[PDB]
Every structure is written in structure tokens, then in C-alpha cells.
Amino acid sequence: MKVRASVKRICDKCKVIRRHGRVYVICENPKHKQRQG
Numbered sequence: 003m004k005v006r007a008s009v010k011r012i013c014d015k016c017k018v019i020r021r022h023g024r025v026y027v028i029c030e031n032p033k034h035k036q037r038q039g
């Protein structure tokens with residue numbers, strides 16, 4: 003899975019996760035819930 007997206011942290015609550023060659027962006031703020039790929 004690959005997409006032209008580079009989910010980066012936005013505020014002091016988002017965290018970039020690392021999984022099967024995949025990445026996620028989870029945060030208390032729902033506006034920062036992103037995921038690479």
C-alpha cells in the first residue's frame with residue numbers, strides 16, 4: 003500500500019505510528035487522524 007501522502011504530526015497530541023510498512027497519525031484531535039498510504 004503506497005499513496006502520495008506524508009501524514010505528519012500537527013499539534014502536541016498526534017503520534018505517528020509504524021506498522022506493516024504503513025504509518026498512522028493518531029491524536030486526541032480528530033482533525034489529525036491520518037495514516038500514510
Ligand SMILES: [Zn+2]
Nearest residue numbers: 013016029034
Ligand atoms: Zn494533534
